[PDB]
Amino acid sequence: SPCQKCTSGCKCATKEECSKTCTKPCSCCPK
Numbered sequence: 764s765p766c767q768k769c770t771s772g773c774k775c776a777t778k779e780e781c782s783k784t785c786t787k788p789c790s791c792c793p794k
């Protein structure tokens with residue numbers, strides 16, 4: 764489940780940028 768900024772706004776292109784808006788693969792970032 765993606766946070767409140769990943770819904771229509773997933774900004775993580777990879778787990779590297781994922782450490783910026785989240786800490787793990789929400790339901791949209793990488794696997």
Ligand SMILES: [Cd+2]
Nearest residue numbers: 766769785789
């Ligand atoms: Cd997220």
Ligand SMILES: [Cd+2]
Nearest residue numbers: 775781785792
């Ligand atoms: Cd993320």
Ligand SMILES: [Cd+2]
Nearest residue numbers: 769773791792
């Ligand atoms: Cd995401």
